[PDB]
Enzyme design. Structure first.
Site, PDB file in Angstrom:
ATOM      1  N   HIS A 126      62.488  17.733  43.859  1.00 29.34           N
ATOM      2  CA  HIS A 126      62.065  18.561  44.638  1.00 29.34           C
ATOM      3  C   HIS A 126      61.627  20.141  44.339  1.00 29.34           C
ATOM      4  O   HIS A 126      60.572  20.676  44.651  1.00 29.34           O
ATOM      5  CB  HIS A 126      63.305  18.656  45.891  1.00 29.34           C
ATOM      6  CG  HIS A 126      62.945  19.508  47.088  1.00 29.34           C
ATOM      7  ND1 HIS A 126      61.569  19.451  47.732  1.00 29.34           N
ATOM      8  CD2 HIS A 126      63.462  20.404  47.409  1.00 29.34           C
ATOM      9  CE1 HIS A 126      61.669  20.370  48.819  1.00 29.34           C
ATOM     10  NE2 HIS A 126      63.006  21.162  48.569  1.00 29.34           N
ATOM     11  N   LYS A 133      57.437   7.915  45.223  1.00 30.49           N
ATOM     12  CA  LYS A 133      56.196   8.617  44.812  1.00 30.49           C
ATOM     13  C   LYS A 133      55.940   8.235  43.389  1.00 30.49           C
ATOM     14  O   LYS A 133      54.717   7.853  43.143  1.00 30.49           O
ATOM     15  CB  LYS A 133      56.413  10.334  44.604  1.00 30.49           C
ATOM     16  CG  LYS A 133      57.075  10.731  45.987  1.00 30.49           C
ATOM     17  CD  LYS A 133      57.537  12.204  45.875  1.00 30.49           C
ATOM     18  CE  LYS A 133      58.531  12.289  44.925  1.00 30.49           C
ATOM     19  NZ  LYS A 133      59.677  12.023  45.860  1.00 30.49           N
TER      20      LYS A 133
HETATM   21  N1  LIG Z   1      61.724  -2.291  47.626  1.00 30.24           N
HETATM   22  C1  LIG Z   1      61.091  -1.306  47.348  1.00 30.24           C
HETATM   23  N2  LIG Z   1      61.615  -0.333  46.363  1.00 30.24           N
HETATM   24  C2  LIG Z   1      60.773   0.584  45.940  1.00 30.24           C
HETATM   25  C3  LIG Z   1      59.347   0.903  46.462  1.00 30.24           C
HETATM   26  N3  LIG Z   1      59.030   1.866  46.038  1.00 30.24           N
HETATM   27  C4  LIG Z   1      59.935   2.465  45.031  1.00 30.24           C
HETATM   28  N4  LIG Z   1      61.133   1.851  45.139  1.00 30.24           N
HETATM   29  C5  LIG Z   1      62.370   1.774  44.410  1.00 30.24           C
HETATM   30  O1  LIG Z   1      62.759   3.198  44.899  1.00 30.24           O
HETATM   31  C6  LIG Z   1      63.596   3.981  43.670  1.00 30.24           C
HETATM   32  C7  LIG Z   1      62.666   5.182  43.675  1.00 30.24           C
HETATM   33  O2  LIG Z   1      61.376   5.038  43.446  1.00 30.24           O
HETATM   34  P1  LIG Z   1      60.743   6.240  42.700  1.00 30.24           P
HETATM   35  O3  LIG Z   1      59.053   6.234  42.581  1.00 30.24           O
HETATM   36  O4  LIG Z   1      61.506   6.563  41.400  1.00 30.24           O
HETATM   37  O5  LIG Z   1      60.770   7.354  44.072  1.00 30.24           O
HETATM   38  P2  LIG Z   1      60.493   9.015  43.588  1.00 30.24           P
HETATM   39  O6  LIG Z   1      61.734   9.587  43.257  1.00 30.24           O
HETATM   40  O7  LIG Z   1      59.920   9.247  45.145  1.00 30.24           O
HETATM   41  O8  LIG Z   1      59.514   9.136  42.479  1.00 30.24           O
HETATM   42  C8  LIG Z   1      63.340   2.957  42.394  1.00 30.24           C
HETATM   43  O9  LIG Z   1      64.500   2.280  42.289  1.00 30.24           O
HETATM   44  C9  LIG Z   1      62.071   2.104  43.028  1.00 30.24           C
HETATM   45  O10 LIG Z   1      62.053   0.791  42.359  1.00 30.24           O
HETATM   46  C10 LIG Z   1      59.171  -0.323  47.435  1.00 30.24           C
HETATM   47  O11 LIG Z   1      58.003  -0.340  47.840  1.00 30.24           O
HETATM   48  N5  LIG Z   1      59.878  -1.223  47.668  1.00 30.24           N
HETATM   49 MG   LIG Z   2      59.486  10.409  40.843  1.00 34.26          MG
END
Ligand SMILES: Nc1nc2c(ncn2[C@@H]2O[C@H](COP(=O)(O)OP(=O)(O)O)[C@@H](O)[C@H]2O)c(=O)[nH]1
Ligand SMILES: [Mg+2]
Ligand SMILES: Nc1nc2c(ncn2[C@@H]2O[C@H](COP(=O)(O)OP(=O)(O)O)[C@@H](O)[C@H]2O)c(=O)[nH]1
Ligand SMILES: [Mg+2]
Lengths: 384, 383
Positions: free
Chosen positions: A75, A15
């Site tokens: 969450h 996200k």
């Molecule tokens: N390979 C890849 N990794 C991703 C992508 N989007 C997020 N990540 C990785 O997944 C992890 C979590 O992303 P984050 O944005 O922190 O997730 P959130 O917790 O949903 O906000 C991070 O280490 C990112 O670099 C993507 O499109 N491709």
């Molecule tokens: Mg996040």
């Protein structure tokens, strides 16, 4: 007038990376500030009526609309944000990792979105730079569509974009195009919010004052809609419902012909005696909202370290429910196999109030005990 | 016959430390083996096929009984272990941190304990070396008692020991004494399990046969109890229930007079045609179990890496329900606001089978789709 959106989904599904990718791609065309991932990944504590939430807020505009975007670390922050109404999303961007498919928090956010009335959703199937197999991507997409349909959303026609939030942040134009695709899908699928002035009129009464010979003036903030002199209103809540004719509207001391959402106005009701009206009641467009003693709602019980209860409560818990301007005592019943609600829990409850309050689906309320707020709720069903 | 116990409770409340503390203290009397915290906490993850459950196992004897004690690392391990029945527990030791009070996994483990039939519980109020002030401890204790009672347990009489797992493990004799108080509580509050051979007889029919001159013979394993030649049984499942007298029991090609739990035996039934018996039925002591098409159950959906579904299933999922020896197709109805069950989830469900199967509270079953296991369940209510 901007559109409120937000990134929902399971933890680590991307996200915050997607939020930074949108801002980065759009900043190249001067449509946003260069917001970095690390500014958003930080948990920025905020305060919304007793509930502390970690939540980030960015702004950007498309070729059609300006947007306010909310993104949260945990969450628990999404649960708190959506129940209290501190978020208020005209549309949600559901991020689902193609490498994980639908996860428990993906389902919970969609359910909460249905309960707090989020109209529509756009899906970003993320991490497609990892899960490059198209048959894997389609299986996840079809699962997301079934999940959206099972919760009342249009799973058949919900836009789903296959992209990579990470590679879009890196400047790869093949993946940057998916960010453009997502923005056009948000422009076309997420409806522009109805103006608060076109909604049914509602005003929460704070004070009453008798104008001898004419009637009773009630004062309060117009929460939504618009009221005009000569129109008929309903007085809902606490006391038996009744109708009255508005013969006067004044704000400072000028005598106005109308009052709209955001106004703090005095409303003159013809022939109404001061004993008939009281704080906590609402003025409303006739038939637009009804009084209720029984309702279903989702609630979040504050943690001890947030000022909430120190122990859990059982069936028959009898606290105070704060609706707009007053509190009303009610008794709480719990769903089956939930016998104790602990601090920090979120749960559905059913509430039998001692006095009727004007409430609908989406009405917000605070649960109070000894004057301190122990929980926040959002009405999901009027059960009378 | 030892007693099966285990430490349950929220993560980081001291289950593994208490497990090591019990063994270390009793090992001083030769009643266990000295066990370090790292032996259990840092044991490797499980590297096999199918449902993956991480669990450690120790043994110790109190003054009165011998104990088999199971301790699991993660919350998901306790859910899987109790639902599948691989962690059969005659009693549980609920560990509750005096610093954190009851937490969501504390309530969750109690609920699961009732649904799988754990009869009783003792409570080890832990970390009383940090949360000194007996008033703070007594408040957490009342909260545990209220939680126990709210879920059908006898919270008023449940033994609660105020101890410190860490200081007992390190050899503090003041806290070591509370390990011995816990053993006394377990000895007296946890009932000795009923012997399997003394339970109502149950045998799951696998094969049916006609010995042309002799009669119908059904063959299967005795789940519990004892069958004797001349006793009357009931044929429960897949057909209108009826009674029949056992006239023969055969094992290893010999005519025998009895069969007991564990035995695979061919049972000759008087006045029973072969068209009246089939795999999936059970032989049982009359009146001990009934056939049902509808039941409630707690189920765990296997993750993809465990060989389960790659995607979630919806309301109306119509899979196979494998009961002992055969599967019966049935429809799943989900609880309110649960519109999809994902791989890795656990949830209560309601089932309507196409045919009546013999089942009761605690009956275990598998959810199967195309022959492969996608879920595991435990019947919680029969309708
Ligand atoms: N390979 C890849 N990794 C991703 C992508 N989007 C997020 N990540 C990785 O997944 C992890 C979590 O992303 P984050 O944005 O922190 O997730 P959130 O917790 O949903 O906000 C991070 O280490 C990112 O670099 C993507 O499109 N491709
Ligand atoms: Mg996040
Ligand atoms: N001070 C103190 N710490 C404890 C006690 N019991 C457990 N701990 C600590 O709590 C942490 C987690 O305990 P653990 O046994 O792993 O809990 P589990 O996850 O339920 O098995 C460990 O670092 C222990 O050292 C106690 O009685 N006193
Ligand atoms: Mg452990």
């Amino acid at each position: 007038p901007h559109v409120n959106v937000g990134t929902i989904g399971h933890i680590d599904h991307g996200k915050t990376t997607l939020t930074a990718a949108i801002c980065t791609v759009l900043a190249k065309e001067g449509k946003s500030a260069a917001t970095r991932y690390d500014q958003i990944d930080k948990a920025p504590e905020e305060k919304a009526r007793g509930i502390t939430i970690n939540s980030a807020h960015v702004e950007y505009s498309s070729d059609k609309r300006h947007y306010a975007h909310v993104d949260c670390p945990g969450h628990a922050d999404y649960i708190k944000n959506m129940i209290t109404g501190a978020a208020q999303m005209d549309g949600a961007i559901l991020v689902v990792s193609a490498t994980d498919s639908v996860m428990p928090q993906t389902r919970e956010h969609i359910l909460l979105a249905r309960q707090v009335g989020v109209p529509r959703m756009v899906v970003f199937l993320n991490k497609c730079d990892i899960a490059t197999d198209e048959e894997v991507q389609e299986l996840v997409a079809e699962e997301v569509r079934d999940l959206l349909t099972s919760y009342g959303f249009d799973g058949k026609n919900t836009p789903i974009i296959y992209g990579s939030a990470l590679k879009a942040l890196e400047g790869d134009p093949k993946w940057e195009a998916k960010i453009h695709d997502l923005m056009n899908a948000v422009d076309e699928w997420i409806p522009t919010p109805e103006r608060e002035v076109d909604k049914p009129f509602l005003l929460a009464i704070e004070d009453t004052m008798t104008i001898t010979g004419r009637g009773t003036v009630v004062t309060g903030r117009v929460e939504r809609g618009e009221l005009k002199v000569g129109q008929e209103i309903e007085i809902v809540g606490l006391r038996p419902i009744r109708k009255a004719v508005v013969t006067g509207i004044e704000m400072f001391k000028k005598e106005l012909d109308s009052a709209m959402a955001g106004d703090n106005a005095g409303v003159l009701l013809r022939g109404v005696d001061r004993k008939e009206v009281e704080r906590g009641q609402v003025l409303a467009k006739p038939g637009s909202i009804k009084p209720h003693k029984k309702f279903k709602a989702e609630i979040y019980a504050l943690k001890k370290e947030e000022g909430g209860r120190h122990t859990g409560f059982l069936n028959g818990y009898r606290p105070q429910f704060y609706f707009r301007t007053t509190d009303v005592t009610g008794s709480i019943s719990l769903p089956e196999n939930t016998e104790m609600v602990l601090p920090g829990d979120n749960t559905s409850i059913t509430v039998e109030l001692i006095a009727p309050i004007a409430c609908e689906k989406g009405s917000k309320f605070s649960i109070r005990e000894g004057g301190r707020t122990v929980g926040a709720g959002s009405v999901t069903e009027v059960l009378e």
